[PDB]
Amino acid sequence: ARGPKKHLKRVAAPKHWMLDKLTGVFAPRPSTGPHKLRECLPLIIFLRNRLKYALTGDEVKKICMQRFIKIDGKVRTDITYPAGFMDVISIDKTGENFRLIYDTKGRFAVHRITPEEAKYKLCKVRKIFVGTKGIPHLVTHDARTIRYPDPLIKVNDTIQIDLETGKITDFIKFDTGNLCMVTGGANLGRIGVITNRERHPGSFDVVHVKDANGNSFATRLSNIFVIGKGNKPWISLPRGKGIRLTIAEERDKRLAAKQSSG
């Protein structure tokens, strides 16, 4: 090519968006922002395809510019905004707040959070950066360059930031036994405690995660995101709670739900 890509094919869209292929040849190309293209979910998909308020793309265009959608403390009027992990999309008209949390599968789950829960979110830091005048810096998953952080926050800890002020409240130390959120891969959407850390110099470190039901599994540290200390989470949890119980009993639960109600 001779420059950056601007279009996006419907076939080339990621599988967790669950967009049907019979509608259009193209897919909503996400705009650049604090999250990457693949694991984010555009605001047009969250409204038209997830919540079904809107039918067509022009209908999404009008609603976003009525200034009724407030993503994580700032109103964005772009239909293809890269809404990443746990962006607190707050809707003022109906008094309803959405935080983008993964389901037990790889898809984003439509999770309604309480308004007092909407003021804070958990961000995973990436590096401790020294500024031009001996200024410590932290860079979160959504590229929040927070100067003067708490000095005990390390490379892969998570900070409970506050949305209306843009500053942190607490932080969770990366240690074994703490709760975790597997953000990526085949174990995408899993919730479990951390049981073992394996060191690999040069290569990628892999961390074993014990599930709440005792289904221990491994995951590299790049797709690992702690969510709380011990067995106590710091946010609300969707139904399923990230277990990935095997497909033999989703056959059982789906069959039992139909016959019980009739």
Partner: protein, 177 residues
């Protein structure tokens, strides 16, 4: 074919012309194109000569020295109003605008006036007063958060060195057993 300023010939030549060159109208940004231009020295191979009379002679031609074609537009910028009427830098120049009367059939007699550019208005002064609030906001915020961090850096300092004395006391206690 138009003739080009400073080409030092009398015939016709072809030249690459970019933006800023005469006898060329670019369409794309940085567009370059060859243009056939005539020489600058005038000979008997010309059709039309554009002539500009600098000093008027004592004789009066009926075509040009008699026909008065006035200005087309009035001065628009605020500072250019001051130099036209030899005003000062303190008085108001808004009433000294060069406006024109408008009269034609089918419409009422109206009057149109230009917008005075680069004129001091309370909106710009408020905007100037708005950006100095950000400078007061910035300088206070850097001093507030650095002092909070310096207090925070003192907060961690008492606990870090207190726990240092636990290892040193352990280093003596383990060696005593």
């Amino acid at each position: 074919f138009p003739m080009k300023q400073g080409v030092l010939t009398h015939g016709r030549v072809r030249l690459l012309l970019s933006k800023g060159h005469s006898c060329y109208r670019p369409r794309r940004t940085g567009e370059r194109k060859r243009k056939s231009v005539r020489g600058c020295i005038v000979d008997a191979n010309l059709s039309v000569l554009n002539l500009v009379i600098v000093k008027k002679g004592e004789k009066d031609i009926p075509g040009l020295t008699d026909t008065t074609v006035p200005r087309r537009l009035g001065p628009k910028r605020a500072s250019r109003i001051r130099k036209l009427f030899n005003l000062s830098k303190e008085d108001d120049v808004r009433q000294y605008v060069v406006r024109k009367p408008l009269n034609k059939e089918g419409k009422k007699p109206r009057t149109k006036a230009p917008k005075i550019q680069r004129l001091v208005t309370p909106r710009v002064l408020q905007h100037k007063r708005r950006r100095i609030a950000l400078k007061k906001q910035r300088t206070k915020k850097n001093k507030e958060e650095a002092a909070e961090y310096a207090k925070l850096l003192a907060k961690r300092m008492k606990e870090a060195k207190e726990k240092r004395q636990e290892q040193i006391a352990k280093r003596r206690r383990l060696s005593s057993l």
